[PDB]
Amino acid sequence: GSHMGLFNAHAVAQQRADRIATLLQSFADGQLDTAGGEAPAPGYERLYDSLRALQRQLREQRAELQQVESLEAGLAEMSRQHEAGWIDQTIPAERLEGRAARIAKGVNELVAAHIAVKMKVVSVVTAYGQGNFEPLMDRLPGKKAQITEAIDGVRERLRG
Amino acid sequence: GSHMGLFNAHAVAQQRADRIATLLQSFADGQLDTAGGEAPAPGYERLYDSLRALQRQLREQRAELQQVESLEAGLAEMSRQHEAGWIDQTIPAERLEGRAARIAKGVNELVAAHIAVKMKVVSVVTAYGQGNFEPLMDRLPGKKAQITEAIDGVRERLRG
Ligand SMILES: [Cl-]
Ligand SMILES: [Cl-]
């Protein structure tokens, strides 16, 4: 409450500000591990609340970007496997979660559809390759129509 | 420098703390638009530096999660298009960037490979469907080997 009082106040305010600066710094440097601890006094309660709120967020967002890194990893893996013909490989969707998992599942099902059209073609053409000319290629939509009529083309030939 | 001085110091420190709390709050609520402005005094310079550093980060991370939202969008679109047979559709990789763009390109090329094996099959089977038995299905790796030998199967039949 004198001059020494005012100086001391500032010395303290300065320090409070300093640890807060340290926390925000270990937040920019991905160290969301250390909780800020208790506020030093009433005047900083809200700030510290926002500090935790900011931590909880910086955390989630980090997890999500991570997932996305696993996704690009598994996709890469799946691509490698498929070029080599190991077409039963898929991005391990289970290991992922959230947005990343959805994307992963989308990719697997998208390829699955394409692969299915081949399993059929490979089939009703295997039969055609050994006499049986009974089966027909499934009617396919849009530009996949070709496949359906190219298999029908070879069906006429063999027939007769 | 008296009692009124100490009180005033605290009134100020309290306020400084308050705006800082407001900034960190509009950072948790995705409002990374407002720069903190200048520090109120030396003791808060570093803290404000970390405040900007934290803003620049919260920004980037938001952009990335966004990209990932476009990605899941385009993938969805591509899936819709393909089920309907519009197999020339692709995730618009250009509109994206960073990790998301890479993933998008991966997905497009992964499907492209699968589609290519079909373009060939549809071809060397169209020929087989109209007399020509000269062309051969390309030797394929792993489990795609089937396709290559199922087309060879029907090649023998037609031949002779
Ligand atoms: Cl291999
Ligand atoms: Cl349509």
PDB file of C-alpha atoms and ligand atoms in Angstrom:
ATOM      1  CA  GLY A   1       0.000   0.000   0.000  1.00  0.00           C
ATOM      2  CA  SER A   2       3.052   2.251  -0.333  1.00  0.00           C
ATOM      3  CA  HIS A   3       5.627   2.464  -3.095  1.00  0.00           C
ATOM      4  CA  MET A   4       7.045  -0.924  -2.238  1.00  0.00           C
ATOM      5  CA  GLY A   5       3.507  -2.280  -2.459  1.00  0.00           C
ATOM      6  CA  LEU A   6       2.912  -1.005  -6.006  1.00  0.00           C
ATOM      7  CA  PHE A   7       6.295  -2.346  -7.108  1.00  0.00           C
ATOM      8  CA  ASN A   8       5.494  -5.752  -5.633  1.00  0.00           C
ATOM      9  CA  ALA A   9       2.107  -5.825  -7.323  1.00  0.00           C
ATOM     10  CA  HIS A  10       3.782  -5.302 -10.684  1.00  0.00           C
ATOM     11  CA  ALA A  11       6.484  -7.847  -9.905  1.00  0.00           C
ATOM     12  CA  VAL A  12       3.655 -10.362  -9.324  1.00  0.00           C
ATOM     13  CA  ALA A  13       1.463  -9.306 -12.249  1.00  0.00           C
ATOM     14  CA  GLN A  14       4.601  -9.581 -14.367  1.00  0.00           C
ATOM     15  CA  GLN A  15       5.200 -13.133 -13.169  1.00  0.00           C
ATOM     16  CA  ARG A  16       1.581 -14.190 -13.634  1.00  0.00           C
ATOM     17  CA  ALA A  17       1.828 -12.888 -17.175  1.00  0.00           C
ATOM     18  CA  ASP A  18       5.025 -14.835 -17.540  1.00  0.00           C
ATOM     19  CA  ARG A  19       3.695 -18.284 -16.705  1.00  0.00           C
ATOM     20  CA  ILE A  20       0.649 -17.571 -18.877  1.00  0.00           C
ATOM     21  CA  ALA A  21       3.086 -16.773 -21.678  1.00  0.00           C
ATOM     22  CA  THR A  22       4.890 -20.049 -20.994  1.00  0.00           C
ATOM     23  CA  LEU A  23       1.630 -22.034 -21.147  1.00  0.00           C
ATOM     24  CA  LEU A  24       0.517 -20.437 -24.395  1.00  0.00           C
ATOM     25  CA  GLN A  25       3.998 -21.191 -25.676  1.00  0.00           C
ATOM     26  CA  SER A  26       3.893 -24.860 -24.821  1.00  0.00           C
ATOM     27  CA  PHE A  27       0.509 -24.810 -26.608  1.00  0.00           C
ATOM     28  CA  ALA A  28       1.967 -23.532 -29.841  1.00  0.00           C
ATOM     29  CA  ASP A  29       4.701 -26.142 -29.509  1.00  0.00           C
ATOM     30  CA  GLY A  30       2.263 -29.042 -29.311  1.00  0.00           C
ATOM     31  CA  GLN A  31       2.689 -29.639 -25.570  1.00  0.00           C
ATOM     32  CA  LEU A  32      -0.980 -29.836 -24.614  1.00  0.00           C
ATOM     33  CA  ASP A  33       0.000 -32.202 -21.788  1.00  0.00           C
ATOM     34  CA  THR A  34       0.467 -29.697 -18.961  1.00  0.00           C
ATOM     35  CA  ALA A  35      -2.766 -28.290 -17.525  1.00  0.00           C
ATOM     36  CA  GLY A  36      -2.358 -24.628 -16.574  1.00  0.00           C
ATOM     37  CA  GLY A  37      -2.990 -25.412 -12.918  1.00  0.00           C
ATOM     38  CA  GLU A  38      -5.055 -23.099 -10.729  1.00  0.00           C
ATOM     39  CA  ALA A  39      -5.468 -19.419 -11.583  1.00  0.00           C
ATOM     40  CA  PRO A  40      -3.252 -17.236  -9.360  1.00  0.00           C
ATOM     41  CA  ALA A  41      -6.197 -15.122  -8.244  1.00  0.00           C
ATOM     42  CA  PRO A  42      -9.809 -14.149  -9.046  1.00  0.00           C
ATOM     43  CA  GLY A  43      -8.898 -11.701 -11.801  1.00  0.00           C
ATOM     44  CA  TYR A  44      -7.366 -14.520 -13.817  1.00  0.00           C
ATOM     45  CA  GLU A  45     -10.021 -17.174 -13.315  1.00  0.00           C
ATOM     46  CA  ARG A  46     -11.813 -16.580 -16.631  1.00  0.00           C
ATOM     47  CA  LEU A  47      -8.540 -16.293 -18.570  1.00  0.00           C
ATOM     48  CA  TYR A  48      -7.493 -19.682 -17.171  1.00  0.00           C
ATOM     49  CA  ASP A  49     -10.908 -21.115 -18.066  1.00  0.00           C
ATOM     50  CA  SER A  50     -10.286 -20.024 -21.662  1.00  0.00           C
ATOM     51  CA  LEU A  51      -6.812 -21.444 -21.287  1.00  0.00           C
ATOM     52  CA  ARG A  52      -8.214 -24.921 -20.575  1.00  0.00           C
ATOM     53  CA  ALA A  53     -10.914 -24.520 -23.186  1.00  0.00           C
ATOM     54  CA  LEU A  54      -8.145 -23.654 -25.620  1.00  0.00           C
ATOM     55  CA  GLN A  55      -6.210 -26.721 -24.526  1.00  0.00           C
ATOM     56  CA  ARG A  56      -9.127 -29.107 -24.967  1.00  0.00           C
ATOM     57  CA  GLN A  57      -9.525 -27.725 -28.458  1.00  0.00           C
ATOM     58  CA  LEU A  58      -5.869 -27.733 -29.481  1.00  0.00           C
ATOM     59  CA  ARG A  59      -5.961 -31.376 -28.387  1.00  0.00           C
ATOM     60  CA  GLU A  60      -8.930 -32.545 -30.437  1.00  0.00           C
ATOM     61  CA  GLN A  61      -7.680 -30.714 -33.507  1.00  0.00           C
ATOM     62  CA  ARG A  62      -4.327 -32.406 -33.125  1.00  0.00           C
ATOM     63  CA  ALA A  63      -5.947 -35.834 -32.894  1.00  0.00           C
ATOM     64  CA  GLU A  64      -7.933 -35.150 -36.060  1.00  0.00           C
ATOM     65  CA  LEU A  65      -4.931 -34.053 -38.093  1.00  0.00           C
ATOM     66  CA  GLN A  66      -3.183 -37.193 -36.846  1.00  0.00           C
ATOM     67  CA  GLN A  67      -6.004 -39.444 -38.024  1.00  0.00           C
ATOM     68  CA  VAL A  68      -5.667 -37.742 -41.395  1.00  0.00           C
ATOM     69  CA  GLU A  69      -1.994 -38.694 -41.380  1.00  0.00           C
ATOM     70  CA  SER A  70      -2.830 -42.355 -40.745  1.00  0.00           C
ATOM     71  CA  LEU A  71      -5.389 -42.141 -43.519  1.00  0.00           C
ATOM     72  CA  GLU A  72      -2.856 -40.915 -46.066  1.00  0.00           C
ATOM     73  CA  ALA A  73      -0.605 -43.695 -44.780  1.00  0.00           C
ATOM     74  CA  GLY A  74      -3.124 -46.507 -45.183  1.00  0.00           C
ATOM     75  CA  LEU A  75      -4.252 -45.153 -48.531  1.00  0.00           C
ATOM     76  CA  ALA A  76      -0.621 -45.250 -49.643  1.00  0.00           C
ATOM     77  CA  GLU A  77      -0.362 -48.822 -48.393  1.00  0.00           C
ATOM     78  CA  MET A  78      -3.559 -49.821 -50.146  1.00  0.00           C
ATOM     79  CA  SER A  79      -2.284 -48.245 -53.371  1.00  0.00           C
ATOM     80  CA  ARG A  80       0.966 -50.170 -53.130  1.00  0.00           C
ATOM     81  CA  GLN A  81      -0.846 -53.432 -52.469  1.00  0.00           C
ATOM     82  CA  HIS A  82      -3.239 -52.913 -55.355  1.00  0.00           C
ATOM     83  CA  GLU A  83      -0.673 -52.043 -57.988  1.00  0.00           C
ATOM     84  CA  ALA A  84       0.900 -55.367 -57.121  1.00  0.00           C
ATOM     85  CA  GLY A  85      -2.512 -56.981 -57.562  1.00  0.00           C
ATOM     86  CA  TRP A  86      -3.194 -57.668 -53.871  1.00  0.00           C
ATOM     87  CA  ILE A  87      -6.696 -56.283 -54.329  1.00  0.00           C
ATOM     88  CA  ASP A  88      -8.112 -57.589 -51.064  1.00  0.00           C
ATOM     89  CA  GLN A  89      -6.189 -55.011 -49.080  1.00  0.00           C
ATOM     90  CA  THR A  90      -8.105 -52.125 -47.620  1.00  0.00           C
ATOM     91  CA  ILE A  91      -7.388 -49.079 -45.486  1.00  0.00           C
ATOM     92  CA  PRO A  92      -7.800 -50.288 -41.871  1.00  0.00           C
ATOM     93  CA  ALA A  93     -10.855 -48.134 -41.102  1.00  0.00           C
ATOM     94  CA  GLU A  94     -11.259 -49.612 -37.611  1.00  0.00           C
ATOM     95  CA  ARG A  95      -7.886 -48.244 -36.441  1.00  0.00           C
ATOM     96  CA  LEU A  96      -9.155 -44.787 -37.458  1.00  0.00           C
ATOM     97  CA  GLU A  97     -12.122 -42.750 -36.300  1.00  0.00           C
ATOM     98  CA  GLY A  98     -14.188 -39.660 -36.959  1.00  0.00           C
ATOM     99  CA  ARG A  99     -13.872 -37.943 -40.324  1.00  0.00           C
ATOM    100  CA  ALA A 100     -10.821 -39.958 -41.283  1.00  0.00           C
ATOM    101  CA  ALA A 101     -12.625 -43.260 -40.688  1.00  0.00           C
ATOM    102  CA  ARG A 102     -15.540 -42.177 -42.869  1.00  0.00           C
ATOM    103  CA  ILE A 103     -13.200 -41.214 -45.720  1.00  0.00           C
ATOM    104  CA  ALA A 104     -11.337 -44.507 -45.331  1.00  0.00           C
ATOM    105  CA  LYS A 105     -14.581 -46.482 -45.510  1.00  0.00           C
ATOM    106  CA  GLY A 106     -15.623 -44.457 -48.531  1.00  0.00           C
ATOM    107  CA  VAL A 107     -12.417 -45.276 -50.335  1.00  0.00           C
ATOM    108  CA  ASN A 108     -12.671 -48.986 -49.517  1.00  0.00           C
ATOM    109  CA  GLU A 109     -16.294 -49.222 -50.681  1.00  0.00           C
ATOM    110  CA  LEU A 110     -15.576 -47.152 -53.807  1.00  0.00           C
ATOM    111  CA  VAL A 111     -12.862 -49.595 -54.851  1.00  0.00           C
ATOM    112  CA  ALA A 112     -14.959 -52.556 -53.706  1.00  0.00           C
ATOM    113  CA  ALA A 113     -17.668 -51.562 -56.198  1.00  0.00           C
ATOM    114  CA  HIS A 114     -15.140 -51.391 -59.035  1.00  0.00           C
ATOM    115  CA  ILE A 115     -13.651 -54.730 -57.972  1.00  0.00           C
ATOM    116  CA  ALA A 116     -17.099 -56.353 -57.819  1.00  0.00           C
ATOM    117  CA  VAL A 117     -17.818 -55.476 -61.429  1.00  0.00           C
ATOM    118  CA  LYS A 118     -14.618 -57.322 -62.249  1.00  0.00           C
ATOM    119  CA  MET A 119     -15.331 -60.395 -60.138  1.00  0.00           C
ATOM    120  CA  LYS A 120     -18.525 -60.761 -62.165  1.00  0.00           C
ATOM    121  CA  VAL A 121     -16.858 -60.130 -65.530  1.00  0.00           C
ATOM    122  CA  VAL A 122     -14.080 -62.592 -64.622  1.00  0.00           C
ATOM    123  CA  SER A 123     -16.823 -65.076 -63.778  1.00  0.00           C
ATOM    124  CA  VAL A 124     -19.384 -64.949 -66.592  1.00  0.00           C
ATOM    125  CA  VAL A 125     -16.364 -64.943 -68.907  1.00  0.00           C
ATOM    126  CA  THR A 126     -14.769 -67.958 -67.311  1.00  0.00           C
ATOM    127  CA  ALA A 127     -17.971 -69.863 -68.047  1.00  0.00           C
ATOM    128  CA  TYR A 128     -17.920 -68.508 -71.614  1.00  0.00           C
ATOM    129  CA  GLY A 129     -14.351 -69.776 -71.765  1.00  0.00           C
ATOM    130  CA  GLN A 130     -15.397 -73.367 -71.141  1.00  0.00           C
ATOM    131  CA  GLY A 131     -18.628 -73.876 -73.066  1.00  0.00           C
ATOM    132  CA  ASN A 132     -21.356 -72.446 -70.850  1.00  0.00           C
ATOM    133  CA  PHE A 133     -22.903 -69.470 -72.657  1.00  0.00           C
ATOM    134  CA  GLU A 134     -25.920 -69.262 -70.357  1.00  0.00           C
ATOM    135  CA  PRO A 135     -24.914 -66.459 -67.927  1.00  0.00           C
ATOM    136  CA  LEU A 136     -25.210 -62.774 -68.873  1.00  0.00           C
ATOM    137  CA  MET A 137     -23.176 -59.793 -67.697  1.00  0.00           C
ATOM    138  CA  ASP A 138     -25.205 -57.571 -65.376  1.00  0.00           C
ATOM    139  CA  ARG A 139     -26.736 -54.478 -66.923  1.00  0.00           C
ATOM    140  CA  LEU A 140     -24.449 -51.642 -65.796  1.00  0.00           C
ATOM    141  CA  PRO A 141     -25.226 -47.885 -65.470  1.00  0.00           C
ATOM    142  CA  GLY A 142     -23.654 -44.914 -67.236  1.00  0.00           C
ATOM    143  CA  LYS A 143     -20.284 -45.587 -68.840  1.00  0.00           C
ATOM    144  CA  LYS A 144     -19.999 -48.991 -67.204  1.00  0.00           C
ATOM    145  CA  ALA A 145     -22.576 -49.944 -69.820  1.00  0.00           C
ATOM    146  CA  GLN A 146     -19.690 -50.756 -72.162  1.00  0.00           C
ATOM    147  CA  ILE A 147     -18.472 -53.607 -69.995  1.00  0.00           C
ATOM    148  CA  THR A 148     -21.981 -55.057 -70.055  1.00  0.00           C
ATOM    149  CA  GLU A 149     -22.265 -54.940 -73.858  1.00  0.00           C
ATOM    150  CA  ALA A 150     -18.661 -55.905 -74.606  1.00  0.00           C
ATOM    151  CA  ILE A 151     -19.315 -59.124 -72.723  1.00  0.00           C
ATOM    152  CA  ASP A 152     -22.572 -59.550 -74.618  1.00  0.00           C
ATOM    153  CA  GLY A 153     -20.651 -59.067 -77.842  1.00  0.00           C
ATOM    154  CA  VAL A 154     -18.418 -62.052 -77.136  1.00  0.00           C
ATOM    155  CA  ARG A 155     -21.533 -63.926 -76.011  1.00  0.00           C
ATOM    156  CA  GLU A 156     -23.098 -63.836 -79.463  1.00  0.00           C
ATOM    157  CA  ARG A 157     -19.903 -65.017 -81.136  1.00  0.00           C
ATOM    158  CA  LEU A 158     -19.449 -68.044 -78.885  1.00  0.00           C
ATOM    159  CA  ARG A 159     -23.165 -68.729 -79.313  1.00  0.00           C
ATOM    160  CA  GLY A 160     -23.413 -70.732 -82.537  1.00  0.00           C
TER     161      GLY A 160
ATOM    162  CA  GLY B   1       2.668   4.701  -4.949  1.00  0.00           C
ATOM    163  CA  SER B   2       0.207   4.819  -2.047  1.00  0.00           C
ATOM    164  CA  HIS B   3      -2.845   2.693  -1.360  1.00  0.00           C
ATOM    165  CA  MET B   4      -4.732   4.199  -4.256  1.00  0.00           C
ATOM    166  CA  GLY B   5      -1.746   3.341  -6.436  1.00  0.00           C
ATOM    167  CA  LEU B   6      -1.756  -0.364  -5.525  1.00  0.00           C
ATOM    168  CA  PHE B   7      -5.516  -0.536  -6.064  1.00  0.00           C
ATOM    169  CA  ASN B   8      -5.161   1.077  -9.483  1.00  0.00           C
ATOM    170  CA  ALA B   9      -2.386  -1.308 -10.457  1.00  0.00           C
ATOM    171  CA  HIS B  10      -4.664  -4.247  -9.717  1.00  0.00           C
ATOM    172  CA  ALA B  11      -7.595  -2.620 -11.491  1.00  0.00           C
ATOM    173  CA  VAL B  12      -5.342  -2.420 -14.581  1.00  0.00           C
ATOM    174  CA  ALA B  13      -3.743  -5.854 -14.236  1.00  0.00           C
ATOM    175  CA  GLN B  14      -7.279  -7.179 -13.853  1.00  0.00           C
ATOM    176  CA  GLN B  15      -8.347  -5.506 -17.090  1.00  0.00           C
ATOM    177  CA  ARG B  16      -5.276  -6.651 -19.011  1.00  0.00           C
ATOM    178  CA  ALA B  17      -6.075 -10.166 -17.869  1.00  0.00           C
ATOM    179  CA  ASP B  18      -9.616  -9.601 -19.003  1.00  0.00           C
ATOM    180  CA  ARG B  19      -8.926  -8.721 -22.624  1.00  0.00           C
ATOM    181  CA  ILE B  20      -6.414 -11.580 -22.780  1.00  0.00           C
ATOM    182  CA  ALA B  21      -9.215 -13.837 -21.560  1.00  0.00           C
ATOM    183  CA  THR B  22     -11.483 -12.424 -24.265  1.00  0.00           C
ATOM    184  CA  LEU B  23      -8.883 -13.087 -26.982  1.00  0.00           C
ATOM    185  CA  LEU B  24      -8.260 -16.652 -25.869  1.00  0.00           C
ATOM    186  CA  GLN B  25     -12.026 -17.038 -25.825  1.00  0.00           C
ATOM    187  CA  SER B  26     -12.536 -15.843 -29.362  1.00  0.00           C
ATOM    188  CA  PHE B  27      -9.760 -18.334 -30.222  1.00  0.00           C
ATOM    189  CA  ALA B  28     -11.634 -21.278 -28.795  1.00  0.00           C
ATOM    190  CA  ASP B  29     -14.717 -20.070 -30.647  1.00  0.00           C
ATOM    191  CA  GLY B  30     -13.012 -20.112 -34.036  1.00  0.00           C
ATOM    192  CA  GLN B  31     -12.644 -16.329 -34.322  1.00  0.00           C
ATOM    193  CA  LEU B  32      -8.992 -16.198 -35.350  1.00  0.00           C
ATOM    194  CA  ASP B  33      -9.762 -12.990 -37.262  1.00  0.00           C
ATOM    195  CA  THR B  34      -8.963 -10.412 -34.579  1.00  0.00           C
ATOM    196  CA  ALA B  35      -5.249  -9.891 -33.923  1.00  0.00           C
ATOM    197  CA  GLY B  36      -4.590  -9.267 -30.227  1.00  0.00           C
ATOM    198  CA  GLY B  37      -3.284  -5.782 -30.953  1.00  0.00           C
ATOM    199  CA  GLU B  38      -0.291  -4.366 -29.099  1.00  0.00           C
ATOM    200  CA  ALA B  39       0.713  -5.677 -25.677  1.00  0.00           C
ATOM    201  CA  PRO B  40      -0.358  -3.261 -22.913  1.00  0.00           C
ATOM    202  CA  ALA B  41       3.164  -3.061 -21.519  1.00  0.00           C
ATOM    203  CA  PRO B  42       6.599  -4.745 -21.488  1.00  0.00           C
ATOM    204  CA  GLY B  43       5.618  -7.472 -19.036  1.00  0.00           C
ATOM    205  CA  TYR B  44       3.057  -8.785 -21.501  1.00  0.00           C
ATOM    206  CA  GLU B  45       5.095  -8.608 -24.688  1.00  0.00           C
ATOM    207  CA  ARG B  46       6.119 -12.283 -24.713  1.00  0.00           C
ATOM    208  CA  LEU B  47       2.624 -13.464 -23.744  1.00  0.00           C
ATOM    209  CA  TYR B  48       1.218 -11.515 -26.705  1.00  0.00           C
ATOM    210  CA  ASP B  49       3.908 -12.990 -28.962  1.00  0.00           C
ATOM    211  CA  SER B  50       2.695 -16.452 -27.938  1.00  0.00           C
ATOM    212  CA  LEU B  51      -0.811 -15.165 -28.456  1.00  0.00           C
ATOM    213  CA  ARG B  52      -0.089 -14.418 -32.128  1.00  0.00           C
ATOM    214  CA  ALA B  53       1.920 -17.592 -32.524  1.00  0.00           C
ATOM    215  CA  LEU B  54      -1.090 -19.426 -31.140  1.00  0.00           C
ATOM    216  CA  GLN B  55      -3.337 -17.609 -33.589  1.00  0.00           C
ATOM    217  CA  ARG B  56      -1.220 -18.432 -36.629  1.00  0.00           C
ATOM    218  CA  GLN B  57      -1.379 -22.051 -35.563  1.00  0.00           C
ATOM    219  CA  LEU B  58      -5.081 -22.228 -34.739  1.00  0.00           C
ATOM    220  CA  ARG B  59      -5.540 -20.800 -38.237  1.00  0.00           C
ATOM    221  CA  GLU B  60      -3.492 -23.324 -40.191  1.00  0.00           C
ATOM    222  CA  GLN B  61      -5.006 -26.215 -38.270  1.00  0.00           C
ATOM    223  CA  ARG B  62      -8.457 -24.918 -39.081  1.00  0.00           C
ATOM    224  CA  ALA B  63      -7.635 -24.691 -42.783  1.00  0.00           C
ATOM    225  CA  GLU B  64      -6.371 -28.274 -42.760  1.00  0.00           C
ATOM    226  CA  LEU B  65      -9.453 -29.693 -41.075  1.00  0.00           C
ATOM    227  CA  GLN B  66     -11.502 -27.761 -43.633  1.00  0.00           C
ATOM    228  CA  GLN B  67      -9.623 -29.291 -46.556  1.00  0.00           C
ATOM    229  CA  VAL B  68     -10.377 -32.664 -44.996  1.00  0.00           C
ATOM    230  CA  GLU B  69     -14.054 -31.730 -45.031  1.00  0.00           C
ATOM    231  CA  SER B  70     -13.926 -30.912 -48.748  1.00  0.00           C
ATOM    232  CA  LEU B  71     -12.131 -34.192 -49.299  1.00  0.00           C
ATOM    233  CA  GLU B  72     -14.865 -36.227 -47.630  1.00  0.00           C
ATOM    234  CA  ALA B  73     -17.300 -34.185 -49.715  1.00  0.00           C
ATOM    235  CA  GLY B  74     -15.644 -34.838 -53.069  1.00  0.00           C
ATOM    236  CA  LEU B  75     -15.086 -38.477 -52.199  1.00  0.00           C
ATOM    237  CA  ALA B  76     -18.806 -38.735 -51.473  1.00  0.00           C
ATOM    238  CA  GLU B  77     -19.544 -37.087 -54.808  1.00  0.00           C
ATOM    239  CA  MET B  78     -17.170 -39.391 -56.637  1.00  0.00           C
ATOM    240  CA  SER B  79     -18.802 -42.400 -54.967  1.00  0.00           C
ATOM    241  CA  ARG B  80     -22.242 -41.238 -56.035  1.00  0.00           C
ATOM    242  CA  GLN B  81     -21.097 -40.654 -59.599  1.00  0.00           C
ATOM    243  CA  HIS B  82     -19.418 -44.039 -59.822  1.00  0.00           C
ATOM    244  CA  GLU B  83     -22.283 -46.112 -58.493  1.00  0.00           C
ATOM    245  CA  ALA B  84     -24.300 -44.569 -61.290  1.00  0.00           C
ATOM    246  CA  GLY B  85     -21.543 -45.584 -63.700  1.00  0.00           C
ATOM    247  CA  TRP B  86     -20.161 -42.086 -64.343  1.00  0.00           C
ATOM    248  CA  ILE B  87     -16.656 -43.456 -63.869  1.00  0.00           C
ATOM    249  CA  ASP B  88     -14.820 -40.469 -65.311  1.00  0.00           C
ATOM    250  CA  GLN B  89     -15.584 -38.392 -62.248  1.00  0.00           C
ATOM    251  CA  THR B  90     -12.779 -37.711 -59.839  1.00  0.00           C
ATOM    252  CA  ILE B  91     -12.263 -35.807 -56.606  1.00  0.00           C
ATOM    253  CA  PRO B  92     -11.270 -32.266 -57.694  1.00  0.00           C
ATOM    254  CA  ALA B  93      -7.719 -32.431 -56.304  1.00  0.00           C
ATOM    255  CA  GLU B  94      -6.824 -28.981 -57.656  1.00  0.00           C
ATOM    256  CA  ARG B  95      -9.423 -27.241 -55.458  1.00  0.00           C
ATOM    257  CA  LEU B  96      -7.700 -28.877 -52.465  1.00  0.00           C
ATOM    258  CA  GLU B  97      -4.165 -28.631 -51.149  1.00  0.00           C
ATOM    259  CA  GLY B  98      -1.684 -30.058 -48.686  1.00  0.00           C
ATOM    260  CA  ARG B  99      -2.413 -33.431 -47.118  1.00  0.00           C
ATOM    261  CA  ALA B 100      -5.975 -33.467 -48.382  1.00  0.00           C
ATOM    262  CA  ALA B 101      -4.862 -32.942 -51.987  1.00  0.00           C
ATOM    263  CA  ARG B 102      -2.394 -35.819 -51.753  1.00  0.00           C
ATOM    264  CA  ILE B 103      -5.078 -38.164 -50.399  1.00  0.00           C
ATOM    265  CA  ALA B 104      -7.478 -37.021 -53.121  1.00  0.00           C
ATOM    266  CA  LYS B 105      -4.896 -37.707 -55.827  1.00  0.00           C
ATOM    267  CA  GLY B 106      -4.191 -41.082 -54.269  1.00  0.00           C
ATOM    268  CA  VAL B 107      -7.837 -42.030 -54.381  1.00  0.00           C
ATOM    269  CA  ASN B 108      -8.225 -40.899 -57.996  1.00  0.00           C
ATOM    270  CA  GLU B 109      -5.137 -42.809 -59.159  1.00  0.00           C
ATOM    271  CA  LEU B 110      -6.109 -45.898 -57.138  1.00  0.00           C
ATOM    272  CA  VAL B 111      -9.468 -46.046 -58.904  1.00  0.00           C
ATOM    273  CA  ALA B 112      -7.871 -45.089 -62.221  1.00  0.00           C
ATOM    274  CA  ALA B 113      -5.692 -48.213 -62.039  1.00  0.00           C
ATOM    275  CA  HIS B 114      -8.727 -50.417 -61.407  1.00  0.00           C
ATOM    276  CA  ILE B 115     -10.619 -48.700 -64.229  1.00  0.00           C
ATOM    277  CA  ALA B 116      -7.688 -49.147 -66.626  1.00  0.00           C
ATOM    278  CA  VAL B 117      -7.685 -52.899 -66.133  1.00  0.00           C
ATOM    279  CA  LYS B 118     -11.317 -52.785 -67.192  1.00  0.00           C
ATOM    280  CA  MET B 119     -10.817 -50.572 -70.235  1.00  0.00           C
ATOM    281  CA  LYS B 120      -8.372 -53.208 -71.463  1.00  0.00           C
ATOM    282  CA  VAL B 121     -10.618 -56.164 -70.620  1.00  0.00           C
ATOM    283  CA  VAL B 122     -13.571 -54.405 -72.289  1.00  0.00           C
ATOM    284  CA  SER B 123     -11.329 -53.933 -75.316  1.00  0.00           C
ATOM    285  CA  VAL B 124      -9.562 -57.244 -75.954  1.00  0.00           C
ATOM    286  CA  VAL B 125     -12.971 -58.816 -75.337  1.00  0.00           C
ATOM    287  CA  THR B 126     -14.763 -56.594 -77.792  1.00  0.00           C
ATOM    288  CA  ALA B 127     -12.342 -57.817 -80.449  1.00  0.00           C
ATOM    289  CA  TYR B 128     -12.949 -61.406 -79.305  1.00  0.00           C
ATOM    290  CA  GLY B 129     -16.639 -60.623 -79.679  1.00  0.00           C
ATOM    291  CA  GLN B 130     -16.300 -59.870 -83.380  1.00  0.00           C
ATOM    292  CA  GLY B 131     -13.826 -62.401 -84.752  1.00  0.00           C
ATOM    293  CA  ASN B 132     -10.396 -61.013 -83.912  1.00  0.00           C
ATOM    294  CA  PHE B 133      -8.709 -63.425 -81.493  1.00  0.00           C
ATOM    295  CA  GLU B 134      -5.257 -61.889 -81.904  1.00  0.00           C
ATOM    296  CA  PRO B 135      -4.996 -59.609 -78.821  1.00  0.00           C
ATOM    297  CA  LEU B 136      -4.125 -60.983 -75.369  1.00  0.00           C
ATOM    298  CA  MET B 137      -5.099 -59.708 -71.929  1.00  0.00           C
ATOM    299  CA  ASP B 138      -2.127 -58.146 -70.148  1.00  0.00           C
ATOM    300  CA  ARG B 139      -0.366 -60.315 -67.599  1.00  0.00           C
ATOM    301  CA  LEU B 140      -1.622 -59.015 -64.241  1.00  0.00           C
ATOM    302  CA  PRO B 141       0.027 -59.272 -60.771  1.00  0.00           C
ATOM    303  CA  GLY B 142      -1.223 -60.948 -57.602  1.00  0.00           C
ATOM    304  CA  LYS B 143      -4.943 -61.681 -57.522  1.00  0.00           C
ATOM    305  CA  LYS B 144      -5.575 -59.670 -60.670  1.00  0.00           C
ATOM    306  CA  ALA B 145      -3.985 -62.678 -62.348  1.00  0.00           C
ATOM    307  CA  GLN B 146      -7.457 -64.219 -62.557  1.00  0.00           C
ATOM    308  CA  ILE B 147      -8.719 -61.545 -64.916  1.00  0.00           C
ATOM    309  CA  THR B 148      -5.742 -62.230 -67.171  1.00  0.00           C
ATOM    310  CA  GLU B 149      -6.366 -65.991 -67.320  1.00  0.00           C
ATOM    311  CA  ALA B 150     -10.165 -65.810 -67.422  1.00  0.00           C
ATOM    312  CA  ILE B 151      -9.810 -63.790 -70.604  1.00  0.00           C
ATOM    313  CA  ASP B 152      -7.286 -66.306 -71.900  1.00  0.00           C
ATOM    314  CA  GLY B 153      -9.771 -69.053 -71.132  1.00  0.00           C
ATOM    315  CA  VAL B 154     -12.375 -67.555 -73.450  1.00  0.00           C
ATOM    316  CA  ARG B 155      -9.578 -66.959 -75.960  1.00  0.00           C
ATOM    317  CA  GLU B 156      -8.913 -70.663 -76.426  1.00  0.00           C
ATOM    318  CA  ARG B 157     -12.598 -71.447 -76.885  1.00  0.00           C
ATOM    319  CA  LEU B 158     -13.158 -68.843 -79.594  1.00  0.00           C
ATOM    320  CA  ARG B 159      -9.903 -70.012 -81.177  1.00  0.00           C
ATOM    321  CA  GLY B 160     -10.893 -72.978 -83.342  1.00  0.00           C
TER     322      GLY B 160
HETATM  323 CL    CL C   1       4.293 -58.292 -54.314  1.00  0.00          CL
HETATM  324 CL    CL C   2     -27.478 -40.782 -63.163  1.00  0.00          CL
END
